[PDB]
Amino acid sequence: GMKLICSKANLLKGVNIVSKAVPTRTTMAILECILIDASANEIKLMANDMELGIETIIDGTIEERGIIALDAKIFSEIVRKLPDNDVTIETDASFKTVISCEKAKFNIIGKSGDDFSYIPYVERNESIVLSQFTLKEVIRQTIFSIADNDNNKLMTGELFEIEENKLRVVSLDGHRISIRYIEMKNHYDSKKVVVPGKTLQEISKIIPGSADEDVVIYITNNHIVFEFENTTVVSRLIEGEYFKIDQMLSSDYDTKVRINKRELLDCIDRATLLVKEGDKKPIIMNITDGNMELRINSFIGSMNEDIDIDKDGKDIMIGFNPKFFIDALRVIDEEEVNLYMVNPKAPCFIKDDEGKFIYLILPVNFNT
Amino acid sequence: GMKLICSKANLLKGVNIVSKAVPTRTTMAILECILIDASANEIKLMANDMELGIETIIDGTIEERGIIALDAKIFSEIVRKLPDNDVTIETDASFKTVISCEKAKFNIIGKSGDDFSYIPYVERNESIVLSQFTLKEVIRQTIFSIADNDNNKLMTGELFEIEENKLRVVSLDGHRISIRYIEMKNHYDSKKVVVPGKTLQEISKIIPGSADEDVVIYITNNHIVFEFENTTVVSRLIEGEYFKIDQMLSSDYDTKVRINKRELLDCIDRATLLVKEDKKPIIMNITDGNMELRINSFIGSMNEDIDIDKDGKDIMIGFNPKFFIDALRVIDEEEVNLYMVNPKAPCFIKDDEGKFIYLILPVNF
Ligand SMILES: [Cl-]
Ligand SMILES: [Cl-]
C-alpha cells in the first residue's frame, strides 16, 4: 500500500484547488472523492465530475507508490485542521487509511482508484496565453448573464471566439447579451467554442488573478484545458452552433445617452428595495433633454429619481428589469457609459468608446 | 405633519442601532416599526419588543414637530441606499411619508405613533461603569452556555451579581456552567439580577467594544438600563430565585492538569470533524505527562497525545466536545488548569488569577 509525506500547507492548497470539481450534491459516490495518485514520481491530486476535471501536483516524498480515493469533505477537513507540520498518508490493501501529523492520527477508509474516472488525455496543439487577471476579469464581466436553467444547453455556457489577435467572450440568456473584447499581442488560428458556465465559475474560485502571472489555454475539439501554477483544469465543451448574434448588433439608434455609471447604478439599486421576491416590477426610464427620470412603484411604495444626462436624438420612455442593468453596471469600471436605443420595444446597448464591451438588454414589452 | 432634515450617516448609524430591538416576529404589527419621535427638541429613534427597547438621538433639524412609525425593514433599506447627503423626512395627517435626498424621493406610508409602546421611564439610582470592551468580552465569554430552549426561563438569561468591587456573570444550561469574575475600581451596593439572553446578544451587536469608551449601567428592580454614546438600551429582568451554584464550586479534586490551551482546543476541534448531523463523546486518558484523546464514529477514528503536567490520579473521562470547544474559544490564557474528581463528577477549567470558572459535566459513557 501507498505511503507519502507532504507539508500540510502544500496538501491544503492542493485539496482546496481540486475540491472545486467535486460535485456539491450527487447520487454518484466515487465522484464525492479526491484521488491521490502517487503511482509514478509525482504526487497528483485529482477530482473529476465527468464534465470538469482538476489536477494539481503536491510537493512531497513518495515512500511507497500507490493510489487511493478519499472522501473529499472528510479529507479536506482533516488536512485543514491538522497542525502545520509534515503529514503522512499511509494506506493498506483493505483501503484503511492513516493520516498522521505530529502527535495526531486519523483512521479513515478509502476507495480503490480503479473506480475513479481519470481526466482524459487532451492533445496540446496551439496555446493561448492570458494573464490570470484578464481571464478572471472577463469571466466576472460576462458570467452573470448565462441561463439560470437547462432549457437550452448552449445558453448555460459562454462562447469563446478567437480571430487573429482578438478574443471575444459572449453570454446570453434570452433577455440580454454580454460581450467582452480583448486585444491580444499574439496571432492565433480561428476558434469558436462554448465553455460550460460551471467550468468558468469554478475556475474563478481557484485563479488568484495576478496581472503578472499567466494562464495557458488549449482548445482541442471537444475539450478546453487551462494551465496555471501547478494546476490543470480540463473541461468538456458544449456541442452545437452558437446563436448568430452579429446580426443583432445593428449599429442604428434613435437615442444616445451619456450618463455617469455610478449614479445610474446607485439609483437602479435604490429602486430594487421596493420590489421583493414575490414582485416583478420594471424600472421606468423617461429620457428627455439633459435628464433621465427613473420610477418604480409597488405595494411597499414608490420612488422617483432624476439623473443629469447628455442626450442626443429622440425623447424616450422605456422599461426594464432592474436586475439586468445592475448586473452589467456592477462590472463596468468606466466613469461614464453610453446607452443606445431605437424604441421602447427594441434592445438597449451599453457600449464604450474603446470597443471593450457591449451589453445588450431587452426592455419590458408593455404591448403599447 | 412632521418635517426633519438629517445627515444620511447620522440617520444610518441610528437605524442600525435601534433595529436590534425590532422583533423578527411579533403579534403586534406596530412593533415591526421604528418610531421617529421629533415632538420635543430632539430627534429620537426608538424600537421596542416589550422585553428590550432601544432609543437613540439623531443630530438634525426639526422643521415641523411630529411623530411617525415606519416599517423598520423598509426605512433602514431606504436610509442605507440613499446618497450621502441630507435626508428630508416629511409626513402628512394621512401618514403618507416622503423621504428625499439629492434628486431621489421615496413615498411610503407610516403609522400613528399612538399605537406604539414607548420604553417605560426607569428611575436612575446607583450607576455601574464598565468599558465597552469589558462588557462585550464578558458576554462573549459566557453567552454560549445559556439554554437553547425555553423549558426554564432563568436558564435563558445570565446572572449579574455585584458585591463591593466584584462583578460575577453566570450562565448555565444544565450540562455546564460559565462564570466570569471582574474586579472593578468602584465599590457598589449588592445586586443580583438575571438579564435575558436576547438582551445581551443584541447589545453585543451595537457596542463597538473600545477599551477607552464606557457603558453606564442602572439596575432598578425590574429593569436594567445600558447607556453608551447617544444610545439607551432598556431591558426587563427575569423574575425568580437563580440556581444555588456556590455549593457546586467545591474546591476538592483528585486530578489537576496543566495543558496548553491552543493545543487542547485544536485537538478537540480536529475530533469534531468525525461527528456529523451523530453525537459521540471525546474520551480523555490522563496519565503522567500525557493526555490521550480519542473519538470513534462511522466516518473513522482519531487518536491524539498532548503533553501535560498532571498532579493526582490517572483518569479516563468522556465529554461532549462542543462544551470544551465553546469554553476554550473564549479563554485567552496560553495555559489552562483542569480539575477533576472522578469520571462521573464535574470538570473545572480555572485560571490562577480567579478570572473564570468553566464547569463541564462529563458524559457517563
Ligand atoms: Cl490533459
Ligand atoms: Cl451598529
Q: After which residues is chain A broken (C to N over 2.5 A)?
A: none
Q: Which residues pair with A209 in a beta bridge?
A: none
Burial of A16 (0-12, 13-18, 19+ CB in 10 A): middle
Report d(CA B268, CA B293) in Å as an integer.
8
Rounded to 10°, the helix B197-206/B132-140 angle is: 130
A336-341, strands of its sheet edge to edge: A157-172, A176-196, A357-361, A348-351, A336-341, A255-260, A310-313
> What DSSP line would sit under B231-249, residue for residue?
EEEEEE---SPPP--GGG-
The cell numbers describing B138, all together, are 464578558
Report d(CA B53, CA B73) in Å as an integer.
17
Preferred mutation among A277, A303, A306, A309 to probe B, highest tally of B CBs within 10 A: A303
Q: Are residues A30 and A84 in the same domain?
A: yes
Resolution attained, angstroms:
2.3
Q: How crowded is the C-beta side of A338, counted as CA atoms within 13 Å?
A: 14
Q: Cβ of B266 and A103 within 8 Å?
A: no
Q: Reduced to 3 states, what is the DSSP secondary structure of residue B78?
A: helix
Report d(CA B274, CA B262) in Å as an integer.
20
The domain boundary, picked from A178, A210, A237, lies at: A237
**Separation of CA A327 from chain center:** 14
- Cβ proximity of A351 and A338 under 8 Å: yes
Q: Cβ of B106 and A303 within 8 Å?
A: yes
> What DSSP line would sit under A204-242, residue for residue?
HHH----SSSEEEEEEETTEEEEEETTEEEEEE---SPP
For A18, A110, B6, B275, B346, the CA distances from B220, given in Å and listed in that order, are: 60, 63, 34, 46, 35
Q: Are residues A104 and A253 in the same domain?
A: no
Experimental method: X-ray
Ligand nearest to the CA of B80: 2
* Structural domain count, chain B: 2
Q: Are residues B362 and B249 in the same domain?
A: yes
- Give the number of A-B residue pairs with CB atoms closer than 8 Å: 68
The domain boundary, picked from A237, A269, A295, lies at: A237
Please enumerate in sequence order all residues whose Cβ is within 8 A of that of B241, keeping only pairs 6 or more positions apart, or say none. none
Query: Which residue on chain B is closest to A267 by alpha carbon?
Result: B104
Report d(CA B179, CA A264) in Å as an integer.
54
Q: Are residues A127 and A139 in the same domain?
A: no
Q: Are residues A191 and A228 in the same domain?
A: no
A127-131, strands of its sheet edge to edge: A66-71, A33-38, A43-48, A52-58, A231-236, A223-228, A214-220, A127-131
For A134, A166, A189, the CA distances from A125, given in Å and listed in that order, are: 22, 19, 11
Count of residues making up chain A = 368
Report d(CA B320, CA A160) in Å as an integer.
54
Q: Are residues B185 and B173 in the same domain?
A: yes
Residue type for position A291:
N
Nearest CB to A273; choose among B78, B299, B303: B78
Q: Are residues A312 and A251 in the same domain?
A: yes
Centre of ligand 2 to C-alpha B125, Å, is 28
- The environment of the single-atom ion ligand 1, i.e. residues with CB closer than 5 A, is A 122
Range of the domain at A72: 1-131+197-237
Q: Cβ of A108 and B267 within 8 Å?
A: no
Q: Which residues pair with A87 in a beta bridge?
A: A6
Strands B300-307 and A104-109, by their bridges, are antiparallel
Q: Reduced to 3 states, what is the DSSP secondary structure of residue A1?
A: coil
Rg (CA), chain A: 25
Backbone dihedral angles phi then psi of residue B180, each to the nearest 5 degrees: -120, 140
Chain B neighbors of A300, CB-CB under 8 A = 74, 108
Nearest CB to B270; choose among A81, A266, A301: A81
The cell numbers describing B37, all together, are 419621535
Strands A127-131 and A214-220, by their bridges, are antiparallel
Q: Are residues B108 and B187 in the same domain?
A: no
Q: How crowded is the C-beta side of A94, counted as CA atoms within 13 Å?
A: 5
For chain A, how are helix, strand and coil distributed in percent, rounded to 5?
A: 20, 45, 35
The domain boundary, picked from A220, A237, A254, lies at: A237
- Exposure b/e, B320-337, CB count within 10 A at least 16 = b: bbbbbbbbbebbebebbb
Rounded to 10°, the helix A72-81/A8-18 angle is: 150
Q: Cβ of A104 and B303 within 8 Å?
A: yes
Report d(CA A73, CA A34) in Å as an integer.
9
Q: Are residues A162 and A297 in the same domain?
A: yes
For A97, B136, B181, the CA distances from B188, given in Å and listed in that order, are: 61, 21, 15
**Separation of CA B16 from chain center:** 17
The cell numbers describing A33, all together, are 472523492
- Residue whose entry in the numeric block shows the C-alpha cell 467572450: A169
- Cβ proximity of A270 and A305 under 8 Å: yes
> Closest Cα of chain B to A81: distance in Å?
6
The H or E element that residue B73 is part of is helix B72-81
For A94, A105, A278, B273, B300, the CA distances from B296, given in Å and listed in that order, are: 19, 12, 47, 11, 6
Preferred mutation among A70, A297, A298, A304 to probe B, highest tally of B CBs within 10 A: A304
CATH number at residue A350: 3.10.150.10
Q: Are residues B217 and B336 in the same domain?
A: no
Chain B neighbors of A108, CB-CB under 8 A = 299-300
Q: Are residues A170 and A37 in the same domain?
A: no
Q: Reduced to 3 states, what is the DSSP secondary structure of residue B289?
A: coil
Q: Cβ of A273 and B81 within 8 Å?
A: yes
CA nearest to A55, candidates A21, A96, A99, A97? A21
Q: Cβ of B104 and A303 within 8 Å?
A: yes
Q: Cβ of B103 and A74 within 8 Å?
A: no
- Cβ proximity of B74 and B107 under 8 Å: no
Q: Are residues B26 and B119 in the same domain?
A: yes
